[model samples]
Target: MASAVGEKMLDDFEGVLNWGSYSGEGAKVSTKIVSGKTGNGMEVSYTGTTDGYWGTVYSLPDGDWSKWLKISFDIKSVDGSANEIRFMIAEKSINGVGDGEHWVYSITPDSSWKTIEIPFSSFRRRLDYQPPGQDMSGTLDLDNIDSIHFMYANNKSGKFVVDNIKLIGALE
Candidate 1:
């Protein structure tokens, strides 16, 4: 019921929720907390209708994650279909001048839950936006991370469950 040494618990979805969903351009998406792999987990379903986006977002308290080594989470595909999902993080905006990055990973749950760990180096800068005069440096500002996103790509329909999101590494 608690995170062990060097593990920072992001969410267990056991109490008050801090997650939400975003859908656009006719995309249909929804999320709810239900019985999960442990106690409670989030179930997200999406139908990508058009050339838009759909996903679940978890708001994170702004903090320095420079010491964290990787992000770990448990997830399963509810409909037995392998789907591609994008995980993203954004730095806090100072006068709207921050950046975001994303990494694409495919999930093939097939009715069984699995734990996934992603190192920070696998992520790439999302070319969606860039501030004027800012260099297109591929470095992530771990000190100002403010949010995490789980997005369904491929303009398809799928359902998945996620739980036990944690940041793993030594923390000062």
Candidate 2:
């Protein structure tokens, strides 16, 4: 996987990423601001144990993820067990109710900025991931590019910090 800071030097990202929701009631997430040359570096944070989870999804148009290669985020662990953070990506539309369908990967109690990456291919029907193969989307059906979220699902709860979250196009 490439560095989030360096990848932008390759291609201009065609989508907009926004920080959105949480785990449950008392749950919340926000931007973890970092000093950047452009002064726009921001990380996602999960704080305070709520009754459930809270966060946001990318929600993109039917963008072809066949070439959607890598995803990376810097995570900082704060509170909770070794099972607090979950990195989730999907074709889900974050309904105002937060009941959208999605596939995700989680890292818990890891209190550090560790860069995480997922090859779009690794997301094929594994764990909480269920990519509708050729049977559904056709020959070149794109990835239902949704949003990114740091969640406390699976009864695995706590706080997490995320930064420089992004997806990369397949290298030429």
Candidate 3:
């Protein structure tokens, strides 16, 4: 049951032939398909690593998303503790490769579920990167978005549940 908002609903985690891909310290990252805010979502269990990451990644479907204004999702910690979850997005180049910039934001979620709506403008470069003639002050160009990643890092360890993963068209 996707929430009816001012924007269109994207992935509710109910479709998709598979959950895309999962990665983390050797055998440390784990996931399970379970109940979520909406229908079904994903539960990611991980162990904190000094430099290792653990979570889910979904390859963006081919589409012209220029009309979309923001990406949003619902998440909560499973352990009754506040945890920082990092959301990352990478764009694909014309050659089907990384465009060198990883836009990112981190959200702290507790036992209760929280809905996070991030405008394209809220994403900041997570690395030293600049496109062709573009400065770092510009917002993300949604047209080339390639993938969406939901992860937990920053030396914290916990389990999280995510649902209603969507890219919407309204600025609000």
Candidate 1, 142-166: lDDT as tens digits:
7666567777657878998888988
Please report, in order, the local distance difference test score of every candidate based on alpha carbons.
Answer: 0.73, 0.47, 0.68
Report the Cα RMSD per candidate: 3.4, 7.1, 4.0
Ten-residue region with minimum lDDT total, candidate 1: 99-108
| Number of the candidate with higher TM-score, 1 or 3 | 1
Q: After superposition, how far is residue 36 of candidate 1 from its true place, in Å?
A: 0.6
TM-score of each: 0.82, 0.53, 0.77
lDDT of 3 at 69: 58
Worst 10 residues of 2 by lDDT: 132-141
lDDT digits (tens) for residues 1-172 of candidate 2: 5454324321122224444554456665564444422334444555555355666554443454454456555555556346544556544333433323455555544655566666644432234444432122312224444444445555433544445555555545
Candidates 1 and 3, the one with greater lDDT: 1
Candidate 3 local lDDT, 11-66, one digit each (tens): 67676435654666643676778877987887777677777766666765553467
* Model 2: residue 101 alpha-carbon error in angstroms: 6.1
Q: Candidate 3's C-alpha lDDT?
A: 0.68
